[model samples]
Target: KSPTEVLLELIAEASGTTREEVKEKFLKELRKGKSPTEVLLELIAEASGTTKEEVKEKFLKELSFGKSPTEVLLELIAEASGTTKEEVKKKFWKELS
Candidate 1:
């Protein structure tokens, strides 16, 4: 597999789904010009223990009521994974390319 495909596959596997739903979003975000870092954050969010559905729902609910999606995601990740933002950031920086 190509580098991109391999990364997508790894991400999908880490997200606990064999299907391409995660890959679909990655491509969609790439097409939309979202930063790869932002996209990586989504993968991290998933691998941290929450499903994409739950994250999206929380993001939308927060946005509709006027909250920062980034903050919401950070909170959700911490709550779901029992880790702090500092730890997540440290790991993210260490693991990210």
Candidate 2:
């Protein structure tokens, strides 16, 4: 099989996921400049019908405060939008935790 198809098959088998769903998400991320690592993490959560937070705990957080590494959050913001953490803090700082 081709490389793309090989990856899709691995994703489906590894996460009990579907080919179409992973492809759609992969395409969506590509249109937005997200890298394969971010896409794979998100896809694993989505395909397994799991939450990002849960995956973070089981695979990412290292049993700390239930948050992804600062770098990960930063990467997400960079890939998602050109916004900064300070921007969000300024906008929603008053909402409280």
Candidate 3:
């Protein structure tokens, strides 16, 4: 599967939404370079049956990376999709800050 499919699966699982629904809501946003974390925040609000604070904690609590909004956003996307720290460092270091 493509990264988008994989990421959508993770979001659907985490959000308890049907995969199709998640795709309908997010694929367009993602293709436009919308950070996965922001998309997840919206999904969590829309489908996950949870508050934004809870989702933020899940994305930011451990293996913390960068601080600026975009930096933190990329860290959160990778973390949410369960990408490893090493993978992040190797491929996304520049995006972090």
Candidate 4:
């Protein structure tokens, strides 16, 4: 198996889904010019105790909005973390640009 195929098999088993589902899912992203690296990272984040369920309620809202992270999210991300909103937004903008 290719290394990508091996990783897909691992996710298929570990994430409790069909290997085929993981198969199409990975390919779908590559075709879309993005990988699921952040998605995978999100799973790990949620797996940890780092996410605050209380804030996550709004967090999911922010996620599903179909837009980039707004100032509200910046505040919350920095609001939750020790950094300032400028810190989050400043660095965040650079990534998109």
Candidate 5:
């Protein structure tokens, strides 16, 4: 899989949507100049059966640890997917870039 597939996989799993569903939705907004995080935030809570407050709080608590939104998000998917941060990190060279 390409680097971007990791995010698609994560979103699909969390949202209980198929990969096709996620891809079509994201690509449309992405073409309109939206960032990936914005797209995910717009969908995750409603789609994943999580409340807006819940996901927002998840970020807030992690941000309290002094990590970037980037790091916190990485930590989350790493934990949720049962994969190490290093493994997930390699898939998103966006951090290094």
Candidate 6:
């Protein structure tokens, strides 16, 4: 599958939304060159049913402590959204960028 297709699937899984539901916004981000990690976390946060501010606060705090942003973000996303980190990483990270 194409990277875009892969991304749509990942977002759908993470967000509990249909691929069609996310495709428009996903395409916008893709065209803008946003990092896949960034988009994933954003969608994960949304899927987890939290506001962006909450995720940003936790994400920044994790970054300040020298944690791997990717790792920490995944953990935060999982904790908030209940999706496993392994599932997320395997689905999207390798195909990112």
Q: Note the Cα lDDT for every prediction shown.
A: 0.59, 0.53, 0.58, 0.51, 0.66, 0.68
Badly placed stretches (over 4 Å) of model 5 are 51-61, 74-97
Candidates, ranked, lDDT: 6, 5, 1, 3, 2, 4
TM-score of each: 0.43, 0.44, 0.44, 0.38, 0.54, 0.59
Off by over 4 Å in 3: 13-16, 28-33, 45-47, 65-97
The model with the greatest TM-score is: 6
TM-score winner between candidates 3 and 5: 5
For model 6, what is the alpha-carbon lDDT of residue 68?
77
Task: Let me know the TM-score candidate 1 reaches against the reference structure.
Answer: 0.43
lDDT of 4 by residue, 1-97 (tens): 4434543444454445687876776676567765454333333233233554545565567667764445545545454445676775665565444
lDDT digits (tens) for residues 1-97 of candidate 1: 3434544555555556764887778878888887764674566566666665666666678778886654554545455456675654444444445
Better-scoring candidate (TM-score), 1 or 5: 5
Kindly report which residue pairs in candidate 1 clash with one another.
none
Better of 2 and 4 by lDDT: 2
lDDT tens digits, residues 1-97, model 3? 5544555555575555688988888877778887766775666554445576776775565436545544443445455546664554444433323
Task: For residue 62, give model 1's deviation from the true position in Å.
Answer: 29
- TM match of model 2 to true structure: 0.44
Q: For all the candidates, what are their Cα RMSDs to the real structure?
A: 7.2, 14.8, 7.4, 11.1, 4.5, 4.1
Q: By the TM-score metric, which is better: model 2 or model 6?
A: 6
lDDT per residue as tens, model 5, 1-97: 5534666666566556788888888798788998877665545555546665777788788889787776666656665556787876666675335
Which candidate, 3 or 4, has the higher lDDT?
3
Clash pairs (backbone) in predicted model 4: none
Clash pairs, model 6 backbone: none
How big is the positional error of residue 80 in model 2, measured in Å on the Cα after superposition?
A: 25
Clashes found in each candidate (C-alpha, N, C closer than 3 A): 0, 0, 0, 0, 0, 0
